Design a protein around this nucleic acid. Structure first.
Ligand SMILES: Nc1ncnc2c1ncn2[C@@H]1O[C@H](COP(=O)(O)OP(=O)(O)O)[C@@H](O)[C@H]1O
Ligand code: BEF
Ligand SMILES: [Mg+2]
Length: 426
RNA sequence: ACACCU
């Protein structure tokens, strides 16, 4: 087993000199909470504290990044220290670079990939488009250290993915099913995997994904570092997560309860199911009169996604849809059209609810309320990325009554006005 | 339900 160098974080003197109270005040200013009893390095507060290669710093400055986000301030040094961790922070607040840039430093301290060598960093994600997005970010920065990456996911030909794995990648981004296929058939292996990331980790630990995660992680060396990330960390996944963690540290940004990004204006319209169509058209007529009008509309099922899109297109709306019954080339094409703005309206199932970072989305519409309050927080987080603001509009019916209590709590935490009809439902 | 190999 090639030796795993784990001790390479060098704390900057500007960070090391802070006293414990000063650290607590820095965390307070950034709304960082570290779970009690965990060992945790002091947070950094500038990119030059974070041990990054000069070429990574060059790329960061070229993209006009000036200061790490809160989850980066605490997550960079925790990840760099080699500790297992859980990092929870709001949608759009920079979790991807929080785990990718320490991955690059980690990789740079390991022996070079030989032949027959699988990846050093493995990132798991719940959807194919999110895996592709993370790989694009990783390539942007991994190229600085001459690192190779690939994306392993279903619906695309196996051959090119097998080629990339056999050529050698230090960084592999994957959805679980196709990776399991390749592990079972010997197209890659996890004997060099020492940095394992579960992005959208609470989703990856849910009823459908947890057995896939378990099958994968059972094949990885137990001396690996494991890093889990999400905007939501409900109690239900916390004990289960310990099956995949060893001596770990949990960090949070924002309130400890379930919380949305506070840059989102959250509007809830309480209505009957039969009123949704008319109300949607009214809303879209106002949205499409604006200059910045890029909109995602979420629905509950693939069938409703197809039906709503056809209904909208039949009336001349420039809408396209994405869901799991489309071919992967269709899914890729639609999302690229949405990113470019050639199609300003995307209608989607929860396939598009997590992780996707489309810069100029201004509106998220919950045509159907989702199955959980966590799903609501992720969906509305497709707007208000980075420092941007955005608006979410939700249609909430009496059929959704069971979800009302938790929705009210999310609205209250974000200091949003609560529709009296929603209150009257409880 | 929604994702997630074939
Ligand atoms: N330190 C930073 N300053 C400004 N923008 C950033 C910074 N870090 C990341 N971003 C940008 O913020 C956006 C959201 O990042 P992302 O990693 O997708 O969020 P999350 O995973 O937390 O939902 C991305 O476009 C990313 O380039
Ligand atoms: F939480 Be980010 F939207 F992935
Ligand atoms: Mg993310």
């Amino acid at each position: 087993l090639p030796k795993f160098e784990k001790n390479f974080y060098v704390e900057h003197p500007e960070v090391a000199r802070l006293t414990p109270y000063e650290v607590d005040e820095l965390r307070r200013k950034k709304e960082i909470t570290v779970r009690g009893g965990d060992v945790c390095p002091k947070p950094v507060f500038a990119f030059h504290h974070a041990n990054f290669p000069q070429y990574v710093m060059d790329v960061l400055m070229d993209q006009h990044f000036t200061e790490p986000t809160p989850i980066q301030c605490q997550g960079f040094p925790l990840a760099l220290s080699g500790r297992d961790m859980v990092g929870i922070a709001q949608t759009g607040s920079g979790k991807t670079l929080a785990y990718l840039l320490p991955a690059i430093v980690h990789i740079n301290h390991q022996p070079y990939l030989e032949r027959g060598d699988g990846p050093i960093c493995l990132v798991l994600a719940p959807t194919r488009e999110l895996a592709q997005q993370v790989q694009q970010v990783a390539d942007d920065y991994g190229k600085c250290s001459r690192l190779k990456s690939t994306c392993i996911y279903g619906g695309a030909p196996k051959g090119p993915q097998i080629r990339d794995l056999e050529r050698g990648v230090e960084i592999c981004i994957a959805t679980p099913g196709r990776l399991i296929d390749f592990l079972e058939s010997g197209k890659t292996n996890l004997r060099r995997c020492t940095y394992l990331v579960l992005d959208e980790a609470d989703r990856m630990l849910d009823m459908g994904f947890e057995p896939q995660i378990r099958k994968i992680v059972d094949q990885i060396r137990p001396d690996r570092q494991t890093l889990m990330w999400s905007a939501t960390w409900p109690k239900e996944v916390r004990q289960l997560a310990e099956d995949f963690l060893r001596d770990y540290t949990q960090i949070n940004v924002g309130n400890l309860e379930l919380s949305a990004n506070h840059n989102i204006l959250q509007i809830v319209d309480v209505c009957m199911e039969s009123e949704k169509d008319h109300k949607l058209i009214q809303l879209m007529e106002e949205i499409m009169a604006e200059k910045e009008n890029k909109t995602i509309i979420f629905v509950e099922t693939k069938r409703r996604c197809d039906d709503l899109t056809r209904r909208m297109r039949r009336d001349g709306w420039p809408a396209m849809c994405i869901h799991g019954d489309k071919s992967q080339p269709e899914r890729d094409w639609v999302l690229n059209e949405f990113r470019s703005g050639k199609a300003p309206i995307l209608i989607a199932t929860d396939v598009a609810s997590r992780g996707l970072d489309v810069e100029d989305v201004k509106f998220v519409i919950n045509y159907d309320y989702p199955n959980s309050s966590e799903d609501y927080v992720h969906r509305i987080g497709r707007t208000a990325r980075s420092t941007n603001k955005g608006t979410a509009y939700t249609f909430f019916t009496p059929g959704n009554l069971k979800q009302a209590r938790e929705l009210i709590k999310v609205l209250e935490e974000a200091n949003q006005a609560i529709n009296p009809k929603l209150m009257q439902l409880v």
